[PDB]
């Protein structure tokens, strides 16, 4: 049950955007938004 949460452009407020939907923020209303960091095991070697 993952609705593909996004982060707004300037508001930096979380938004739930699903397929076949416009790309806009829940408030104000912009056209830019980025994704959230993956949930995988991001492991680096301090080399």
């Amino acid at each position: 049950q993952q609705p593909m949460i996004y982060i707004c452009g300037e508001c930096h407020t979380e938004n739930e955007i699903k397929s076949r939907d416009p790309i806009r923020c829940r408030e104000c209303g912009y056209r830019i938004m980025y994704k959230k960091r993956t949930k995988r095991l991001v492991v680096f070697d301090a080399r």
Partner: protein, 139 residues
Amino acid sequence: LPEELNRVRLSRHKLERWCHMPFFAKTVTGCFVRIGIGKPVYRVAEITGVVETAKVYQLGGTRTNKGLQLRHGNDQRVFRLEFVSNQEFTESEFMKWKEAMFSAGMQLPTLDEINKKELSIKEALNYKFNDQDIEEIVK
């Protein structure tokens, strides 16, 4: 039964996703909420409609000033969406609500009514926002 009555109970977490969605007076009108009166006693009330209060208050992250015209048998007054509790209808509160309904003369809703009304919230939750409602929401 109390268990069957809690299916349509609109908790405080679900109401945060329909603060500006149209058709608010259609899907919400019919369900019951455990409004907190205040010490730990609660009173279930019927949702007659929707009102708008002149006081603006913040509820966690979001903030809404809309009211909720409730009624418990005969005693009716304006309430707010911030006093609603997330607890389920207890046996004592269930019996109190049943007694209040019997005393007020309002016929208890039929089981099929709740069965067909609980699907309204489910179908509204997965509603695709393809129409021009985002503009009104942001406004």
